[PDB]
Amino acid sequence: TKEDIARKEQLKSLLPPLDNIINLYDFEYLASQTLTKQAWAYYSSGANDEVTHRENHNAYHRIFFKPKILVDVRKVDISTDMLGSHVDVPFYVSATGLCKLGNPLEGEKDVARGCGQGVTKVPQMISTAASCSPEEIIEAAPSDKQIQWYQLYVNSDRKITDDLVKNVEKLGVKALFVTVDAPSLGQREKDMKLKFSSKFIDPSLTWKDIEELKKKTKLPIVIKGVQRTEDVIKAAEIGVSGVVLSNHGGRQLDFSRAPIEVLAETMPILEQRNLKDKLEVFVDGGVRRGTDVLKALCLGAKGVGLGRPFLYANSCYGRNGVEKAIEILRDEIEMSMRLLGVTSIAELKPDLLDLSTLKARTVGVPNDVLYNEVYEGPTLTEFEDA
Amino acid sequence: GETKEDIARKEQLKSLLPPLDNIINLYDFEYLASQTLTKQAWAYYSSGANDEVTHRENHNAYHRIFFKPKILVDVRKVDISTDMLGSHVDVPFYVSATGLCKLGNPLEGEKDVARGCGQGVTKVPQMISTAASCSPEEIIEAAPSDKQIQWYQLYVNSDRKITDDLVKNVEKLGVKALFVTVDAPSLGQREKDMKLKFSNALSKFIDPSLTWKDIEELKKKTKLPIVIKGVQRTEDVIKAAEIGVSGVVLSNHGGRQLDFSRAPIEVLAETMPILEQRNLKDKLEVFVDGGVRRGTDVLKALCLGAKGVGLGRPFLYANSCYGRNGVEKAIEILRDEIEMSMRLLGVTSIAELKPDLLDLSTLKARTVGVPNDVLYNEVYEGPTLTEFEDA
Amino acid sequence: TKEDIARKEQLKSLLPPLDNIINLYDFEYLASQTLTKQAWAYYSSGANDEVTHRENHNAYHRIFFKPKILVDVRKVDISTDMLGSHVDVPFYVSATGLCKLGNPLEGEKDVARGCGQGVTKVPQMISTAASCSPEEIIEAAPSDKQIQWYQLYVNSDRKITDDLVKNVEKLGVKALFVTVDAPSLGQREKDMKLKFSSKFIDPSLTWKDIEELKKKTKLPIVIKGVQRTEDVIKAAEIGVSGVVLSNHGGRQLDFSRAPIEVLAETMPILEQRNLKDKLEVFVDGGVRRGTDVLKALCLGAKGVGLGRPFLYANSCYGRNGVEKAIEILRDEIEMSMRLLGVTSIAELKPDLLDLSTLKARTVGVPNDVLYNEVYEGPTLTEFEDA
Amino acid sequence: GETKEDIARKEQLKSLLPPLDNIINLYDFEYLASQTLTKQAWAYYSSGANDEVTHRENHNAYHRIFFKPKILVDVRKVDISTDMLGSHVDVPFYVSATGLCKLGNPLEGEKDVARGCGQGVTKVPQMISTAASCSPEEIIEAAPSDKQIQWYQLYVNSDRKITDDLVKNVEKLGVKALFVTVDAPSLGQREKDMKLKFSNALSKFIDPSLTWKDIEELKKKTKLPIVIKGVQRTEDVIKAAEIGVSGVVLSNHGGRQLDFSRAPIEVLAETMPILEQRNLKDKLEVFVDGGVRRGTDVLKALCLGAKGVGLGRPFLYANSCYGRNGVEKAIEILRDEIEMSMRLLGVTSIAELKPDLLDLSTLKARTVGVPNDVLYNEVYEGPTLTEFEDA
């Protein structure tokens, strides 16, 4: 609408220096003002009323910390293992389709770059729906040490999916995340409203098919989009490597629970049956601060994913932005680890958390409109007129 | 009390209404109606009893329920048809009785909802109000389809002969059930309505004497299935089963009667397990209404074991902005919302919607916060986001 | 501040016709705009941060109704007995000092008039701190049938209080409410802020003194301002007639509980010890609708008081306003009784109430300012530009 | 990053500040400071770690506690004096350590709080910060009264000789206890502060290695009572008692360090009963700080068994607007708030403040609402009040 005049003025040199970016929300704010209406709609959107998208995040605040004091914390290590690889941090960039809307010149290529160009090396989940080719993305990663996973929507045409699995294996991805929370497309209304002037994805995907995909590949399988303890147990029973507790960033079923709350529930069940070492359990949704990450890890998550935050960093400052987002988050984790009073990821245990109010998921009774309207609050002292 | 704001409202209405294809959800209809209906029409449709808490609560209580969706289930094909009161129904929801539909649709009123409910590929049951602005005969005649279900809403008169003639007439006109409304012996005080009359409660028409005996007698006078509409507690659900009526609507009249009646979704959750405990499982069909605006709302109620879920206001609004095709669009929006969240839920039929698909652990978290600390919050300044360069 | 120009313009003929007053809040609104800054401050005020004042009301919303349908409700009776007198309604006007601030010409006289001038006769509690004399108030009541109670602050000079008790007995008051929640004055900051350009009340009042006051008078004693089950039991043990569960309209101790919540707690204790008939138990605070009254009565209150609502009616439309406030409330009760499915005050029992969430008295965790600020809600469909 | 808004702030400050007698509560000081301090001073004082939730929570958690006041008790005379760490104290509260008090009071800084704490009829303990802008000697010299209590806040340096000299110096200067701060091995990220630096974390100074052994050693090196400041869980309270230190401050540094540390009032409630269960009753004096702004806040903490309650920010604000007499006014406001609500509580001394005066049943109701339904709430129109006549 010939208004992106204003839009290139902000982008251009009105953007703050990267070094002035304090947190992940800063990236989000700037993204909100500079992207095209449709890039913004496509990235920021959730399903229907977007309660789950929001509740993904808010549920972290239903958990508090019980930190240890008087512990030597001079030295902290936040490295860990995810899917047989050693990783610098306990988080990753979750898979995120069509990055070219926000970063038109480089797209998914810049995520790879930002994930390996600096001191800390963060795993990248690549979308089957990436606007770049899997080859353009792997051959762009500036360090052999960095790792890459492939996210898979299994096609109705299973020949397509059988060759895809084979092409990514030989390109060096270290795992397959099979997305199972999107048999039909979540109704994302922000998109639709602006639009006013599936085959891609097989809705028949079965457990039996996952049993089958186990046999046709040597890459480790994580079932991405589990939303129930019962199905975590089912992933164990069929012997996949892992599972992402996820609701697609609240882009699919609205009133899916927060994965953090589901985590809290499933981990203890997985212990009453030996299964803690069997199944790596990942978590995404709503994660915006180092303490969110820490809460997850304390509950038993092997790793925690982020989508939108990185997507927004990438869309404003490309690869450099991604590297900074990594820096911001990695420091948030170390700094708060220290205040928690532990020194390694393996020391992050449930006794560090206060879980007594996890289930305080409330809906107030409607506000008394008349009563509140006529009431006049207390008032501060004023300053003389002089 | 309308100005020549009849004009501001008319240009609004007049071609400024967006194309029907651009309506995404049931709220849109609501929004459009709020700007285009006459002040009296808007007040009559949109209002509730006293402080309107029950009205809003009806809706919010749905949000105290979350889902436990099944993954990696074959959800290629999905069917949302079911049965209600002995008839096959394309859909698990229906249009509840609303009086005076001509305030919003002056030309056609209830006839246009009959048309919307029955014209297209998806057909929806319609409950006809005793306070309908059109006649029963007009509304039944108007029905474009033989396979479409019309039900009749009854207010029993103090003069029982009138009620007797009425029941005989609608049975003969071919309605398929009687919903006897029991939650309005006294008329709920809808203050938005009163606020117009100035600056702009017992009646013989609805008999405040209606009793359990009266319902018992009524069922010997007709072969139509009888439903008690306006049940607000489990004790009365059990009572309904005892007198052997067909069903019950857990309802509070859309928050238009008693304020601080519970959300029907909450009563449902309490009631159905107690109806297993006592065997009465499928002796009584249990319907729920009020505050339903999304397919996931409908799904939650069915998972608790509602036979069907009714909507009032959303259909009023569609009819008032877009007549018959508005009603069909409303039917399509909701139909699609239900099918699509069934797939994501991991079930393929109505019978497969069961309590184990719901997380019910925070159902009871209906809270009133301690008043906030206005001075503390006033002086407090929150974090801010980075700004763009000054220039 | 020569602004009460505006003030007499509203008062004068800008005031809506009495017949256009729908509810008790309407009176409150109009009062808010027309009273002097200091009358408003003096009436509307609560203690410190005014949480209790507000929580008095909000706690009613922590209770829902379980109403009976298919009950013949053609006929309802809301009459009852309070302190050996038959009363038309199950409520009363609580005592309220200095009514001349709002109604300068008539004051406490107009409350009496409004309480007996129309069809329904409501009891009046008279303040020891009334701006009118007890004689001017009793001799103004236009029906002998109407009843009057006296509220007593016992003076440090007990001669003053001994003659006062004697003067009100012979003037025909049918009871004494001894106020015990105000040994020191609650800090009411709205007053203080505007003011910037005790002996009256004995802080040594003891149980022993109430035992003593029992002997020196034949009028029935209600201890007004009980805030604990433990002290209700103490009023029983010393054989007073009644007790008002009250915190002075949140004008005294902030973070006193809502009397409704205290009611809910004490009534069942009074049954596990025979005491339900022994002690009449009254309740005030926050009551603004017929359903508030009904909730109280269902829990076992013998009556429910209101202050501010009547005070505001009286201050805008004097005696006529008071009569209308009575009408508004009395109809609210009958109408909702009917919808509840009972026909007499004695049928108002706890089984009519849903008490499962009485203790859902919550404080949210602080709002996530950044997260919420950047989030953009869903949006309604717009209307064409045309 | 100050404009010649140094001027807008100076006319504000300059005689436009209201008379001290017109200040009603601790919030007023806060308000006045927010308009008169330099941007850096305001950010440094008012800010917390990351999203600042713990900071606000410190305060709100007090509101999860209600009172069970005793009636018809003789409350003519009331006494709020008590003892802390072996000294008699006029009051149950104290001024916690805040660094850099010269940002707000350029001329006098910490010396003016020393004066405010000790000048008048009511005297209040002062904890001196290691990051004080004035010197210990300056601040102690400044104390107008022999009977006034000064305590010292210690950050142990990586170079322990510096800490050793410091402890010997302040002991000799006559401070009455050591508060060793343990909740800041890493510096909390206070983003309001950072937001100025642009567009306008380990240090050798605070040793991140500090250990339980180090505290044990410290107590053999001084006769002063030692308090561990920044205890955030009961497990560490038990640990403090085991090594036989004098006391513990349940504190999270005013929400300036770990975000999502609990409200200390909540930890208090959990901790004290466990300190009966194990006998350790009065082996350890337990202090609480953070979010305290009213006398009833102080009362709640004492009823749970705190020995004393500390305040940071409110005293900073009084000192920054009004220097020494601001501090005294703050002391008087709070002193009066405590005495007056003791009477209404129905007790007459500190020892009489016990758990049975509190309603603790909703202490755990720390909730996060499900996000609200923006579309539902948007279209919804509430009831309105009557209007005055058009004319």
Ligand SMILES: Cc1cc2c(cc1C)[n+](S(=O)(=O)[O-])c1c(=O)[nH]c(=O)nc-1n2C[C@H](O)[C@H](O)[C@H](O)COP(=O)(O)O
């Ligand atoms: C933001 C976003 C997220 C997407 C995403 C696209 C966007 C714009 N997409 S999508 O086009 O199908 O909807 C996917 C995707 O391709 N496949 C997938 O498994 N997850 C996808 N995710 C979800 C992602 O994997 C995380 O679950 C999600 O972003 C986590 O939520 P936050 O963004 O709140 O961290």
Ligand SMILES: Cc1cc2c(cc1C)[n+](S(=O)(=O)[O-])c1c(=O)[nH]c(=O)nc-1n2C[C@H](O)[C@H](O)[C@H](O)COP(=O)(O)O
């Ligand atoms: C919105 C509305 C609802 C009415 C309604 C009128 C309006 C404007 N009316 S009424 O004039 O008596 O109040 C009736 C009616 O005629 N008879 C009846 O049984 N239900 C009536 N209902 C209630 C209706 O049957 C549903 O219970 C109600 O609309 C469901 O709530 P929602 O609108 O929130 O879905």
Ligand SMILES: Cc1cc2c(cc1C)[n+](S(=O)(=O)[O-])c1c(=O)[nH]c(=O)nc-1n2C[C@H](O)[C@H](O)[C@H](O)COP(=O)(O)O
């Ligand atoms: C509104 C108000 C109430 C007063 C009241 C004065 C005002 C302006 N006064 S007072 O000057 O001491 O504070 C008294 C009073 O005289 N004595 C008393 O027992 N109650 C007094 N009450 C409290 C009254 O008895 C009720 O408890 C209170 O008004 C009930 O709260 P609502 O106003 O919210 O119903």
Ligand SMILES: Cc1cc2c(cc1C)[n+](S(=O)(=O)[O-])c1c(=O)[nH]c(=O)nc-1n2C[C@H](O)[C@H](O)[C@H](O)COP(=O)(O)O
């Ligand atoms: C407000 C504030 C508090 C500081 C404070 C500085 C400020 C501006 N500082 S600080 O520079 O390291 O962060 C200290 C300090 O020097 N040393 C210490 O032990 N506590 C320090 N505190 C914390 C103080 O001792 C109390 O725990 C805190 O102020 C209590 O919280 P309220 O302000 O909410 O009462």
